[PDB]
């Protein structure tokens, strides 16, 4: 598959007044690992990150054009972007290449800068918006991640236990995937701070 040429796996999960987003760190070519510190989660605001898995060159292409459009937006308007508007912008940007599609399925996890309601969503590779209230996952080990998150998620969690469940979900999911893993970063988005953590993971 073209999605699985670089591997990669990103998930988001909603908590009480906080969201968590975590992405794998392996940058791969089908069998050969190249580096182990590949950045997939990019900041698009104070309390709003976007995560892009899939073909690792399309992650950087879509993210550079997205930052190009978003900086013009935030300079022309004079406010930070609300996450639903960022979902519509990324769906527009991917759908402009409908028959020439980018091979990335972005996930968006952040906080509304005024209401501080938690928001998570994912997309397909061509721009179907999927707003869910529990979790969204994306990448080559999607079955492992739905299997972990369907059993481990419980509503209304504090950021500590949300960190615990998304960390156990990532670490138990990627160790059954050959072409993903090799380290994981975890971002906890809170109202008053951002917590950036990396985990002990299998390096095989």
């Amino acid at each position: 598959s073209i999605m699985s040429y670089n591997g990669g796996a990103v998930m988001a999960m909603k908590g009480k007044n906080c969201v968590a987003i975590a992405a794998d760190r392996r940058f791969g070519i089908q069998a050969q690992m190249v580096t182990t510190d590949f950045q997939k989660i990019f900041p698009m605001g104070d309390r709003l990150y976007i995560g892009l898995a899939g073909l690792a060159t399309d992650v950087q292409t879509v993210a550079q054009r997205l930052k190009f459009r978003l900086n013009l937006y935030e300079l022309k308007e004079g406010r930070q972007i609300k996450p639903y508007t960022l979902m519509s912008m990324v769906a527009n940007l991917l759908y402009e290449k409908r028959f020439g599609p980018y091979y990335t399925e972005p996930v968006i996890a952040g906080l509304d800068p005024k209401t501080f309601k938690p928001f998570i969503c994912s997309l397909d590779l061509i721009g179907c918006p999927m707003v869910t209230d529990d979790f969204v996952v994306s990448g080559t080990c999607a079955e492992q991640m739905y299997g972990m998150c369907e059993s481990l998620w419980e509503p209304n969690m504090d950021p500590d236990h949300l960190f615990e469940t998304i960390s156990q979900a990532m670490l138990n999911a990627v160790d059954r995937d050959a072409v993903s893993g090799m380290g994981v970063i975890v971002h906890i988005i809170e109202k008053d701070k951002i917590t950036t953590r990396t985990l002990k993971a299998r390096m095989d």
Binding site: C128, Y146, H161, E164, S167, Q168, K193, T196, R197
Partner: protein, 220 residues
């Protein structure tokens, strides 16, 4: 994917499932397949979800032009023409097979639009993977000029049969009621499928997952 519609005495009743699958895995549990287009026209979208998403954005936008321009509420046949012209212009490469249902000044209408731009006018429609199971219930039980509640129970039963007898559908029944005198968007209407109760508890305490680095970034 199981959506349906009927023409009853005062308007249109639309229904849907909520399960959206990618590959052979359930991706979404509460996906809304009954699109807003006009205050009177709603458009159930089956097939390729992103293509019908951008199509029921764009035609909704053009009807928001047109209703403000003429100052009147739009007709069904206007959205029908715009849909069939765009979907014929792209020759079916938009993989959206639509149910365009609405009530205008000439009463209710129900159109089924195939992706290449062929349109049918129907008293009842079913689309998607579970279209045949709900079509069975419609051929068994539909009558012309039904009342509101009989049409609501008929569409809900047909969506239920398409939920139980297909793998490609499940987990909710949304409805919609469209008439001259009312608009009733019943989301959800009946929930035939329920998550089982988890017997064990797997709550990992603090310190269960080892941490290598940590950075606290304060905000205002």
């Amino acid at each position: 994917t199981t959506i349906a519609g009927v023409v009853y005495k005062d308007g249109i009743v639309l229904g849907a499932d909520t399960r959206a699958t990618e590959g052979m895995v359930v991706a979404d549990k509460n996906c809304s397949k009954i699109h807003f287009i006009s205050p009177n026209i709603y458009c159930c979208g089956a097939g390729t979800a992103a293509d019908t998403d951008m199509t029921t954005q764009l035609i909704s936008s053009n009807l928001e032009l047109h209703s403000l321009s003429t100052g009147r509420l739009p007709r069904v046949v206007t959205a029908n023409r715009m849909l069939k012209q765009m979907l014929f212009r792209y020759q079916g490469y938009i993989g959206a097979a639509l149910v365009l249902g609405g009530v205008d000044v000439t009463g209710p209408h129900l159109y089924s639009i195939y992706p290449h731009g062929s349109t049918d006018k129907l008293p009842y429609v079913t689309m998607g993977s579970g279209s045949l199971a709900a079509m069975a219930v419609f051929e068994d039980k539909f009558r012309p000029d039904m009342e509101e509640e009989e049409a609501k129970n008929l569409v809900s039963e047909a969506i239920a049969a398409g939920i139980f007898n297909d793998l490609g559908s499940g987990s909710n029944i949304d409805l919609c009621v469209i008439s001259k005198n009312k608009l009733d968007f019943l989301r959800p209407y009946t929930v035939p499928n329920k998550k089982g109760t988890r017997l064990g508890r797997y709550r990992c305490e603090k310190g269960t997952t080892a941490v290598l680095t940590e950075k606290i970034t304060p905000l205002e």
